Amino acid sequence: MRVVVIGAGVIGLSTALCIHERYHSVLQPLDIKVYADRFTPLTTTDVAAGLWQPYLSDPNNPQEADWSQQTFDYLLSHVHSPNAENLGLFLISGYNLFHEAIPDPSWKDTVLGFRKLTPRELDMFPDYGYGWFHTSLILEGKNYLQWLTERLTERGVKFFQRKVESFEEVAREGADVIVNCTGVWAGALQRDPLLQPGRGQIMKVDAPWMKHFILTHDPERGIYNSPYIIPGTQTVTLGGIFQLGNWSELNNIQDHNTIWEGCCRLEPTLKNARIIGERTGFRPVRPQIRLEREQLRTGPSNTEVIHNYGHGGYGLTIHWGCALEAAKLFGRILEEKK
Amino acid sequence: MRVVVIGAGVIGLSTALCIHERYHSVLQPLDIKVYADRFTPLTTTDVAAGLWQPYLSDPNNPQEADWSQQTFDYLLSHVHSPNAENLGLFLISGYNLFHEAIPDPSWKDTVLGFRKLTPRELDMFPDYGYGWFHTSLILEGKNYLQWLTERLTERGVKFFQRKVESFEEVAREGADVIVNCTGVWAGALQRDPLLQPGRGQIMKVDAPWMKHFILTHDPERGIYNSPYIIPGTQTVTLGGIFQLGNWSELNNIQDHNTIWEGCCRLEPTLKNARIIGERTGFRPVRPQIRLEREQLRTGPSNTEVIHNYGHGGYGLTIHWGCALEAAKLFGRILEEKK
Ligand SMILES: Cc1cc2nc3c(=O)[nH]c(=O)nc-3n(C[C@H](O)[C@H](O)[C@H](O)COP(=O)(O)OP(=O)(O)OC[C@H]3O[C@@H](n4cnc5c(N)ncnc54)[C@H](O)[C@@H]3O)c2cc1C
Ligand SMILES: Cc1cc2nc3c(=O)[nH]c(=O)nc-3n(C[C@H](O)[C@H](O)[C@H](O)COP(=O)(O)OP(=O)(O)OC[C@H]3O[C@@H](n4cnc5c(N)ncnc54)[C@H](O)[C@@H]3O)c2cc1C
Numbered sequence: 001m002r003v004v005v006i007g008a009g010v011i012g013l014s015t016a017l018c019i020h021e022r023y024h025s026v027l028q029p030l031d032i033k034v035y036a037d038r039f040t041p042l043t044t045t046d047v048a049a050g051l052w053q054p055y056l057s058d059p060n061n062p063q064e065a066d067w068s069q070q071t072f073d074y075l076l077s078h079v080h081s082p083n084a085e086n087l088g089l090f091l092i093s094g095y096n097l098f099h100e101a102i103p104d105p106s107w108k109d110t111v112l113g114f115r116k117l118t119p120r121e122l123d124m125f126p127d128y129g130y131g132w133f134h135t136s137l138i139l140e141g142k143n144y145l146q147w148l149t150e151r152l153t154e155r156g157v158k159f160f161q162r163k164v165e166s167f168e169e170v171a172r173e174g175a176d177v178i179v180n181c182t183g184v185w186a187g188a189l190q191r192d193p194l195l196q197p198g199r200g201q202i203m204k205v206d207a208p209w210m211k212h213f214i215l216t217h218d219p220e221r222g223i224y225n226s227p228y229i230i231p232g233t234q235t236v237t238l239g240g241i242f243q244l245g246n247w248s249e250l251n252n253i254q255d256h257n258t259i260w261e262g263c264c265r266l267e268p269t270l271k272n273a274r275i276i277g278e279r280t281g282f283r284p285v286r287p288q289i290r291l292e293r294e295q296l297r298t299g300p301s302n303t304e305v306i307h308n309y310g311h312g313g314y315g316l317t318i319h320w321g322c323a324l325e326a327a328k329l330f331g332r333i334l335e336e337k338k
Numbered sequence: 339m340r341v342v343v344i345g346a347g348v349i350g351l352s353t354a355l356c357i358h359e360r361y362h363s364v365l366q367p368l369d370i371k372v373y374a375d376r377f378t379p380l381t382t383t384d385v386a387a388g389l390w391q392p393y394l395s396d397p398n399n400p401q402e403a404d405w406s407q408q409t410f411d412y413l414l415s416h417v418h419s420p421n422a423e424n425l426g427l428f429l430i431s432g433y434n435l436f437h438e439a440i441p442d443p444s445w446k447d448t449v450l451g452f453r454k455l456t457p458r459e460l461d462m463f464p465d466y467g468y469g470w471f472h473t474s475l476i477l478e479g480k481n482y483l484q485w486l487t488e489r490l491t492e493r494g495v496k497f498f499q500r501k502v503e504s505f506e507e508v509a510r511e512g513a514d515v516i517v518n519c520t521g522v523w524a525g526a527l528q529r530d531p532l533l534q535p536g537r538g539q540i541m542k543v544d545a546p547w548m549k550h551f552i553l554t555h556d557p558e559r560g561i562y563n564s565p566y567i568i569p570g571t572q573t574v575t576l577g578g579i580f581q582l583g584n585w586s587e588l589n590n591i592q593d594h595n596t597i598w599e600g601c602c603r604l605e606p607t608l609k610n611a612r613i614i615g616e617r618t619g620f621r622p623v624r625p626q627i628r629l630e631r632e633q634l635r636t637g638p639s640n641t642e643v644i645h646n647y648g649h650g651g652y653g654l655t656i657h658w659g660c661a662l663e664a665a666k667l668f669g670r671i672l673e674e675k676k
């Protein structure tokens with residue numbers, strides 16, 4: 001079986017691993033390739049802080065609820081293991097702050113220890129009169145990409161730097177199965193008008209006294225257009241910007257100041273914090289994830305395609321459940337092939 | 339008014355500050371000295387992680403409940419201020435773990451967000467079937483000593499390195515008021531058989547993915563003889579040893595291994611963590627704090643003495659309420675002097 005994963009972000013590498021770990025057998029061996037135009041540390045996944053948390057609204061496909069929970073349970077079963085260091089996996093507690101009342105999320109029993117904030121906790125944040133507290137996980141994005149690549153190489157997967165211009169390009173090289181994990185750029189291989197970039201920009205800051213995440217919310221401007229502070233293992237991510245349809249991969253002054261002046265109004269200790277770096281990235285925003293089979297009639301033959309893209313602001317949050325579902329889809333392909 | 343504080347740990351420096359900040363006036367100026375045998379970074383206070391948390395039993399003098407709460411409120415009013423960095427003040431959440439059920443502490447409404455752990459949280463710790471979660475404060479001990487010394491120098495307080503052998507030694511130099519803040523060594527100036535060292539030893543570890551405190555409890559062996567993990571601003575303190583009556587200021591192998599093997603059974607990620615340093619210190623264990631006036635008939639005159647010692651494993655936790663009470667006691671001295 002010749003398999004080609006297009007993509008080397010979280011979705012592509014985890015799907016590569018999950019296909020091998022379930023379907024490379026004594027009876028059927030797989031050749032799994034990974035073709036990518038950019039690899040770690042140069043991907044969207046490497047920009048991300050990596051906090052597990054879905055959207056505040058219930059998801060469009062409600063299988064995404066399951067897939068997110070599956071991913072949390074996978075990571076919670078490993079957080080206290082000594083190799084958690086290598087994945088970049090750790091527990092964090094902290095705050096979700098709202099101006100007004102809001103109902104409980106469709107994930108509150110997935111996280112540990114979920115509660116509303118007391119008035120005394122709310123008194124710590126003058127701008128915010130409602131909110132939650134819970135404990136979740138961070139899975140650091142550069143670390144997990146490093147570790148996944150290691151696991152893949154160990155299992156004989158080969159990596160190749162190339163931009164694929166078409167599915168037919170792979171198919172004439174003899175891909176029996178193409179796994180399409182190309183994120184926000186998937187429209188270049190097949191037109192998808194439902195897929196758009198939600199551009200974000202972030203600051204990494206030196207503030208190691210920060211031990212909680214602090215997410216604020218302005219639902220009028222939607223998810224991600226309100227300040228957030230996220231302690232990572234070495235550095236704190238400061239963020240809170242979303243532009244639908246901006247394709248500029250460039251850090252800018254206005255977005256810097258929006259984040260700086262916003263996060264320093266959240267937590268004034270950040271005014272002292274050394275700025276270490278700044279990054280820009282594109283969330284693959286889609287109404288739902290596309291996690292789907294398609295069969296492609298390109299040239300002298302047909303080829304089977306597993307699509308796995310469109311994971312928005314939640315791709316680390318949902319990756320493992322998506323990779324196992326894409327593995328399920330690969331098993332259907334093998335069943336049809338007999 | 340000639341005042342001499344004996345001691346330059348948290349209790350002596352904060353009491354020095356509080357006396358000046360309340361009673362050095364236009365009408366009555368004070369000369370406040372600080373005599374100490376050791377200063378920062380070489381004191382008991384500098385060893386301490388600095389987590390705010392009293393004992394699990396209600397305190398012997400129940401004014402110590404008030405004094406501890408006063409100290410929490412003082413520090414919570416400042417934790418989000420940009421100068422919190424300089425004091426070493428920050429919020430931390432985390433776990434108090436018990437083998438069996440235990441009733442709620444006499445401080446649970448002082449901390450923010452106090453709750454029992456859920457079964458799912460308890461499932462994270464196999465050895466521990468009961469426990470609490472809450473948010474508290476750390477006040478880093480070397481940092482606050484640095485900052486206090488700065489405030490004192492700024493206000494004209496002078497520091498002198500000397501071991502005082504007697505209260506009469508100070509009194510013949512013309513101390514009108516002696517403030518005795520000598521911790522576990524107070525017995526050398528006046529016999530106190532109720533004061534004993536509770537020797538501890540600690541490891542500082544590089545584990546910056548640790549964002550919660552994790553305290554375990556074995557009430558049979560008492561407070562402090564069970565593993566604890568405490569994320570500080572740069573390094574995580576690993577500890578959990580108490581010896582009543584050990585005066586050996588020396589780190590040892592057995593106590594190292596007790597802590598290492600204990601904290602790594604709590605949280606196996608620590609097996610990867612780089613050990614940065616190790617320290618030994620003596621808690622000034624007494625049945626209650628001595629926070630009291632005495633008048634001393636030494637030589638050609640009498641002298642007024644404020645005692646402020648015996649703060650056990652809770653001296654950072656209670657310091658501010660004790661310093662203000664010792665200030666109250668100084669006001670009584672000034673009232674008697676007219
Ligand atoms: C600032 C920011 C912060 C975020 N924080 C979080 C968070 O805390 N938690 C969370 O759960 N999520 C977070 N996210 C979202 C998360 O980063 C994304 O959902 C996730 O990275 C998408 O992963 P992916 O593998 O689909 O895409 P990408 O990681 O962008 O990888 C796509 C891959 O496809 C390759 N590719 C594309 N087109 C081609 C082609 N034609 N030929 C060959 N290769 C191609 C690329 O080179 C690349 O290797 C954040 C996103 C941003 C922007
Ligand atoms: C390992 C460890 C961890 C701890 N962690 C915590 C924690 O997380 N939270 C918390 O609240 N507490 C904690 N504590 C307890 C806390 O450290 C003590 O209660 C506190 O330091 C006592 O402060 P002090 O000023 O009374 O004494 P010290 O800081 O020991 O200072 C005494 C001063 O007196 C001077 N002195 C003594 N005798 C003389 C003399 N004859 N002449 C002149 N100077 C003299 C000394 O030189 C010194 O300057 C911890 C203690 C230990 C040992």
Ligand SMILES: O=c1[nH]cc(CCc2ccc(C(F)(F)F)cc2)[nH]c1=O
Binds near residue numbers: 053055224239313
């Ligand atoms: O793209 C992204 N994903 C995740 C994060 C982490 C913080 C966060 C999670 C969930 C929401 C919420 F509730 F609005 F959905 C807000 C903020 N940041 C990003 O830029």
Ligand SMILES: O=c1[nH]cc(CCc2ccc(C(F)(F)F)cc2)[nH]c1=O
Binds near residue numbers: 391553555621
């Ligand atoms: O001496 C000390 N003081 C404080 C600490 C911080 C952790 C701690 C607080 C309270 C208890 C309890 F609940 F048992 F009292 C146990 C552990 N460690 C020390 O060595």
